[PDB]
Amino acid sequence: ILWHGRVSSRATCILGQACSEFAPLAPFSIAHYSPQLTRKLFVNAPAGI
Amino acid sequence: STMIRRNVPTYTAYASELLYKRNLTSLFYNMLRLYYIKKWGSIKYEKDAI
Amino acid sequence: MSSLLNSLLPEYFKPKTNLNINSSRVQYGFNARIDMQYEDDSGTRKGSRPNAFMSNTVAFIGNYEGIIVDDIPILDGLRADIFDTHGDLDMGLVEDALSKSTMIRRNVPTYTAYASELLYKRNLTSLFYNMLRLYYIKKWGSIKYEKDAIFYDNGHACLLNRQLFPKSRDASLESSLSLPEAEIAMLDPGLEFPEEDVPAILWHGRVSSRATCILGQACSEFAPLAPFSIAHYSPQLTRKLFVNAPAGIEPSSGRYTHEDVKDAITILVSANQAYTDFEAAYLMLAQTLVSPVPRTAEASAWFINAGMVNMPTLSCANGYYPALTNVNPYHRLDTWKDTLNHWVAYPDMLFYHSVAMIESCYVELGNVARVSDSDAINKYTFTELSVQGRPVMNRGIIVDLTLVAMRTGREISLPYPVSCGLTRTDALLQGTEIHVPVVVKDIDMPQYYNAIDKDVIEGQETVIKVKQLPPAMYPIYTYGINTTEFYSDHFEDQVQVEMAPIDNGKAVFNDARKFSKFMSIMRMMGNDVTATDLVTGRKVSNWADNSSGRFLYTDVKYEGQTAFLVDMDTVKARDHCWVSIVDPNGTMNLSYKMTNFRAAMFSRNKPLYMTGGSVRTIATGNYRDAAERLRAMDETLRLKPFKITEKLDFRVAAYAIP
Amino acid sequence: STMIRRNVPTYTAYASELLYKRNLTSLFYNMLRLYYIKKWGSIKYEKDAI
Numbered sequence: 001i002l003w004h005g006r007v008s009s010r011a012t013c014i015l016g017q018a019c020s021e022f023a024p025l026a027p028f029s030i031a032h033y034s035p036q037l038t039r040k041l042f043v044n045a046p047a048g049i
Numbered sequence: 050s051t052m053i054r055r056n057v058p059t060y061t062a063y064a065s066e067l068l069y070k071r072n073l074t075s076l077f078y079n080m081l082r083l084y085y086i087k088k089w090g091s092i093k094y095e096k097d098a099i
Numbered sequence: 100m101s102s103l104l105n106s107l108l109p110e111y112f113k114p115k116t117n118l119n120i121n122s123s124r125v126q127y128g129f130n131a132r133i134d135m136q137y138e139d140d141s142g143t144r145k146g147s148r149p150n151a152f153m154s155n156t157v158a159f160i161g162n163y164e165g166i167i168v169d170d171i172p173i174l175d176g177l178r179a180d181i182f183d184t185h186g187d188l189d190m191g192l193v194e195d196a197l198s199k200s201t202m203i204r205r206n207v208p209t210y211t212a213y214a215s216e217l218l219y220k221r222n223l224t225s226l227f228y229n230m231l232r233l234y235y236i237k238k239w240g241s242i243k244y245e246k247d248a249i250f251y252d253n254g255h256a257c258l259l260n261r262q263l264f265p266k267s268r269d270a271s272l273e274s275s276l277s278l279p280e281a282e283i284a285m286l287d288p289g290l291e292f293p294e295e296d297v298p299a300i301l302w303h304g305r306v307s308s309r310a311t312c313i314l315g316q317a318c319s320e321f322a323p324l325a326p327f328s329i330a331h332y333s334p335q336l337t338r339k340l341f342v343n344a345p346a347g348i349e350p351s352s353g354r355y356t357h358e359d360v361k362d363a364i365t366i367l368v369s370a371n372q373a374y375t376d377f378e379a380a381y382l383m384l385a386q387t388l389v390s391p392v393p394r395t396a397e398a399s400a401w402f403i404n405a406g407m408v409n410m411p412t413l414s415c416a417n418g419y420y421p422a423l424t425n426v427n428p429y430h431r432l433d434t435w436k437d438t439l440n441h442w443v444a445y446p447d448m449l450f451y452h453s454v455a456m457i458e459s460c461y462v463e464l465g466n467v468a469r470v471s472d473s474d475a476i477n478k479y480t481f482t483e484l485s486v487q488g489r490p491v492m493n494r495g496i497i498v499d500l501t502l503v504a505m506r507t508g509r510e511i512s513l514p515y516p517v518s519c520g521l522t523r524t525d526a527l528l529q530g531t532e533i534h535v536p537v538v539v540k541d542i543d544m545p546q547y548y549n550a551i552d553k554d555v556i557e558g559q560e561t562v563i564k565v566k567q568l569p570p571a572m573y574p575i576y577t578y579g580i581n582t583t584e585f586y587s588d589h590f591e592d593q594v595q596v597e598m599a600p601i602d603n604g605k606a607v608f609n610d611a612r613k614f615s616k617f618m619s620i621m622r623m624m625g626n627d628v629t630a631t632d633l634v635t636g637r638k639v640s641n642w643a644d645n646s647s648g649r650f651l652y653t654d655v656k657y658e659g660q661t662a663f664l665v666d667m668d669t670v671k672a673r674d675h676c677w678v679s680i681v682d683p684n685g686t687m688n689l690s691y692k693m694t695n696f697r698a699a700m701f702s703r704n705k706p707l708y709m710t711g712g713s714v715r716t717i718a719t720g721n722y723r724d725a726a727e728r729l730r731a732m733d734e735t736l737r738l739k740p741f742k743i744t745e746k747l748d749f750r751v752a753a754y755a756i757p
Numbered sequence: 758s759t760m761i762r763r764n765v766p767t768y769t770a771y772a773s774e775l776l777y778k779r780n781l782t783s784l785f786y787n788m789l790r791l792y793y794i795k796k797w798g799s800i801k802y803e804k805d806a807i
Contacts, residue, residue, distance in 0.1 A: 001073075004215070004766070005212075005215060005216060005763060006763065008767070014080065014083065017083060018076055018079040018080045018083060019076065019079070022079075022082075026094040027094075028094065030082050030085050030086060030089075031082070031086060034079065037075050037076065037079065045212075046208075046209045046212040046213065046292065047212070047213070051194070051198065051207045051208040051211065052208075169759055169760060169761065170760070171758060171759075171760075172760050215762070216762055216763060219760060219762050220760050222760060412760065414760055489758075491758045
């Protein structure tokens with residue numbers, strides 16, 4: 001994916017959790033079961049992650 | 050463009066497959082769910098409820 | 100802006116280039132001929148003072164403190180190709196411009212990504228400001244500051260320099276600062292990724308041995324000993340400074356003269372194409388070069404707490420992108436080089452531009468402090484309605500330029516809405532009591548001044564409670580151009596005090612307006628009048644100043660009901676060249692006329708004369724007509740002959756032109 | 758109205774959530790009550806009055 005300038009300290013944590021398995025305990029509608037989207041995600045940002 | 054000259058021939062060959070991989074719907078879907086989980090995070094679910 | 104500050108100067112004032120300042124106090128003013136008249140039922144008594152000196156004392160001391168703030172970027176200088184129709188950096192033409200240049204091919208993709216952040220870091224105002232201060236420190240370096248010296252004295256109350264400025268050691272201006280040098284590294288053109296939070300500047304040819312020492316000291320902390328105006332406290336601008344000079348940077352010399360600082364500025368502005376940045380730095384220093392000595396003892400409330408100077412953060416990314424600066428720059432106004440060209444020609448003219456600006460501001464803050472909060476244009480909301488732009492915050496130069504616009508009564512226009520410099524309106528907006536310290540001389544002080552103690556032995560340190568701020572300066576350069584009835588700065592004026600013979604000299608002024616004009620004109624005539632308020636029971640004296648020689652109504656030091664008893668058999672003749680009121684009977688009519696004006700300056704109780712060449716009004720056209728001319732005389736050495744002519748003697752020869 | 762343009766995406770996100778809840782009416786209400794408590798601060802309330 002592409003990015004504008006520097007990937008912030010919090011943007012790493014959000015993208016990391018977005019591309020992961022949802023394994024819920026309580027049956028909630030916005031926290032349903034989803035498979036692992038991807039294992040690794042590249043980011044073309046000249047300013048380091 | 051501002052590409053490395055030794056990569057142009059090898060990257061152009063791959064273009065036929067890779068340029069038709071454009072669907073970010075799954076990523077935006079999960080990121081929208083994380084927004085509402087942290088906003089309305091204080092809602093409760095009881096096991097023995099009606 | 101040299102242009103707008105030039106128009107503030109009077110018509111009769113014809114300035115010269117050089118001004119040999121050799122002290123930390125100057126009495127600028129004018130000599131006028133006053134034809135006073137006193138008419139009465141008995142008869143008329145005429146007087147005439149041929150040389151009457153009206154002065155405003157201006158010093159080189161004043162407590163200030165610099166703080167680094169975030170300000171808008173100044174986009175004047177960059178090439179006109181990369182800009183779009185609206186006037187903002189169209190990114191896409193930047194990538195096109197960098198590609199078709201003399202850049203390393205492996206750096207193009209990584210440098211273009213950074214462009215979005217780095218190209219909007221253009222503000223060199225902080226660097227030019229410090230380099231201008233170094234010029235004047237080395238020029239007027241021999242001025243002295245004594246610790247136990249008289250800041251103000253009016254006979255009754257005295258205020259020393261120890262009182263206002265503690266932590267203050269006596270020293271010369273040259274010996275005040277001990278500036279440490281910042282590192283001036285050479286930029287490697289083959290650097291992988293640009294280092295943000297480190298500014299990189301351009302240079303023409305080789306950085307000289309003295310240029311290193313000047314740039315090193317300009318980007319450093321100012322930690323002064325003596326409270327000087329051009330050597331106030333400033334934070335460290337930057338730690339390291341890159342310079343993209345293919346010819347290597349020579350090491351620091353250590354010493355430099357004031358002429359070498361002018362050399363450093365002229366190269367920096369030309370290479371970086373930063374003329375609007377210099378214009379901002381020129382107006383900043385114009386505010387904070389000289390501070391006014393207070394007119395009255397209770398007018399020291401303005402200079403108790405230190406006014407903050409807003410210096411914009413040093414940020415420049417020209418060193419990383421040499422291609423984007425060329426000989427065809429983008430500029431808003433056509434007269435964008437006028438301010439630098441004026442300074443290079445006439446450096447010492449800044450002194451006259453400085454006093455013109457502070458006199459304009461402190462006069463208007465005098466008659467702004469005397470308006471009630473319940474009004475449309477009041478103390479808090481006089482800046483907002485006047486400003487028709489989009490500045491970040493209404494502070495610094497915006498508040499000082501809007502006060503000048505009110506004084507002259509004209510429209511002031513700047514190319515960029517920059518908000519940097521000193522903020523004066525600090526003590527005003529607080530709207531609280533200020534406690535100024537004073538050392539007493541006489542024992543009958545606390546009747547006149549609103550003192551904290553009622554009985555005080557001589558040589559005691561007391562406190563005066565100032566509620567409403569009196570005017571700090573009287574209008575002198577702006578005399579009778581935009582006249583108000585408060586100051587009463589007319590050429591012709593008259594007052595009619597109505598008394599009957601049944602009254603034995605005693606007159607009660609029910610009106611406040613004509614009481615002010617009576618007490619003022621009596622002081623021109625050299626008469627010491629002492630009125631007493633009937634309601635409160637305090638006393639006021641017209642002799643409350645030794646500079647202007649006028650009586651403003653704020654010298655009463657109290658707002659109440661107006662019932663001033665003046666006894667006209669206790670009037671004492673004080674000054675020379677005076678008309679006598681021996682014994683008046685019936686209606687009195689006082690009047691004066693100011694006819695001609697001659698510019699005069701005093702220093703160390705001696706006349707200070709202007710020397711050098713005749714200063715002109717430099718226009719953009721006056722230089723570029725010589726560029727239109729080009730000296731188009733083909734540079735061909737054409738030698739013309741002279742025919743010898745013989746006459747009677749023949750021993751001696753005589754040459755003719757044809 | 759800034760030189761540091763790295764913070765614009767973050768600033769916009771927080772501003773959008775806060776601007777739709779701005780109200781200083783409750784602060785001025787208490788500040789006005791403190792003015793009149795000090796001014797008329799000699800009024801007596803007797804419990805066994807009519």
